Amino acid sequence: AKVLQIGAGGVGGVVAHKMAMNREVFSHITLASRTLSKCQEIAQSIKAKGYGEIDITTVDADSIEELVALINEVKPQIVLNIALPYQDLTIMEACLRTGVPYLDTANYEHFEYKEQWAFHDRYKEKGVMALLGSGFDPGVTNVFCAYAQKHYFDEIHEIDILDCNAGDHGYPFATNFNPEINLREVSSKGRYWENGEWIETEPMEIMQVWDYPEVGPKDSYLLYHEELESLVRNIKGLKRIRFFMTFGQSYLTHMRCLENVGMLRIDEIEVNGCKVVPIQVLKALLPDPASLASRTKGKTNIGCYIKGIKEGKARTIYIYNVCDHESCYREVNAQAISYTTGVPAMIGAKLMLEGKWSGKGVFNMEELDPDPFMDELNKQGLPWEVKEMEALEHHHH
């Protein structure tokens, strides 16, 4: 098949590499990004590791007419949106007009699903499929849930998503993304769902020490996360769902200190005559995020702790995946964060092009059969585990 991928960032790289490692499904690969050089750098690594060639081009993903044009010239069977979230809607419109399947790893943001779910009837009518959040979280976390709902429970009551990155880059402080993102995670109020109500919290207000398998105990804080919005819709009998994420104390200290002196401001200021932007100086001071991939060591562990009922008795399982940073860099020239997000995308595409995951309209992961997806994960470098946990019942006569 001929595929067109948009986006050459860290995740974008892993996706292209993984597609180049499955040439029986992805025969002709076209990679398009705003900056041509990023695309070249990826082709360079793909070629060097012996995975073949890939066509590279650029494009203004903000222009529908341009995207339509590019799609009409390449004639792809599926378009992978591994680009910025603020381009979902324009890429989806292009796909709708050309009648070509769509897949992305993050919802719209100018973040919720409303805008994307809005393309549903138009997609179904055009006879086109659109898959959403095909990453690890959202994505594999969604599949773990649907898979658990299919083979381990009759009813799922509580779901906790636990995301931990123990990776260590060797620097006092260094961010993997654009500082504005890191600030947003710890600045936004936390949100979760219980008994059909969305409950908010103060930023980083709720924390627990969870012992992540193969990693050990870590402080885990409660944050909002996009899959919570589709899981409450799909998992039947759900009473509560929360999302937790790992946060080292050293890291939280640097962020707060930087924010305190205003090193995270976006407005301009006068510095010896010339106008400068606080956060831009930070980006220029912190080490290059690209270079962190070869220095990061340690493991990551993301998964779901699920409590429900099975054959009338309480049950509790823990489905998760552990990934090693150094291994990821050796295989696809990227760290575990990009890796865990990129493989699931390659898989969702593979499934869609093979017909194991077909439909007409816009879909979330939990809506499709997880079995073929779960088999691929064990084969593509993201082996998962199911661990039976303590499930105590209290009878009262």
Add this chain to the structure above:
Amino acid sequence: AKVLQIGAGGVGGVVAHKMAMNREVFSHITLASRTLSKCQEIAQSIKAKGYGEIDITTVDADSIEELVALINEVKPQIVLNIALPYQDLTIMEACLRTGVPYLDTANYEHPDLAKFEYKEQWAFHDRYKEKGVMALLGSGFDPGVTNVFCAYAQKHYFDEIHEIDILDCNAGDHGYPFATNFNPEINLREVSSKGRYWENGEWIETEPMEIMQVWDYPEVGPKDSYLLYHEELESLVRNIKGLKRIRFFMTFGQSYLTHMRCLENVGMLRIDEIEVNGCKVVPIQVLKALLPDPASLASRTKGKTNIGCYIKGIKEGKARTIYIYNVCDHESCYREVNAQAISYTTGVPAMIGAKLMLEGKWSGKGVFNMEELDPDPFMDELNKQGLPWEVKEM
């Protein structure tokens, strides 16, 4: 008498003010500097407070000719050097040539090194004595008052002093998450320098900020105190007899140290230029632009400071321990002389040293450190100029 002050920084404004409050001795005041706006700031506060007028003029304290010329024009009876430490030598040469008494509050430091010592200044002794001129070194609180406290205890409370612990605490709060009173480069050297103290005729170094102890400062409470080196240790080991050990400890909040280390880590304290969208940018200059203006802090600082000496020795065959100290309130310092307690505790003492020389209560020919002179008239002026002290029998 006519006096000449060089420099118009925080301490400088305090010195000028206090001098303006003692016209009996300082009847004509001239403030030499390279920053008019700063002098203007000070002159306005002095006038509005009812303490008269002062003459501001400009001069480059790097030029010996300018100084000599300025001094020959003004005919001052004393020159108060409240300028930068690297300028100590040029101002001393000028005073020497014009035969005018000299006084400063910080010892010489070459701009190329971070080493501050008395060597260069002590080397002027014979020329000053021969010329019949007096030079008083480090006339601030520490060094300065701490030295007098020690000379005081040795004259009245001990036959022999064996141990001195100089404790400096600033409990002040400017309300901001983080903010310095000085050029960040300075706050950074304070905590980057090796620690150093003296024991049994020997100098002992430590890793920066290694030794620390919780000390309960009167009117302030228990604070984490760290062992730092300080300039008065160098003269005190010379002048205090029987001394076995001397150490300097300074207070440091945890939040403060956290911000400092964090900032130094991401590179916000670098002085070199980096590129930012094709534009050369000095990190620390961006930091100075984000932090509040040091001048605006004086009016926002609340809280106290406690500086003193913990002394143990022998008095009439028996062991004895005394604690001499001073407590200064930040807000009171702002109301009275338009400055914070850091500036105030260093400034008032410089004024008293000049007062004692101009009245002749402290007279000698050559270069002198505070502990070589009679501390009584100094200790008296302290109770009278806003730095009342207390002696606590341990």
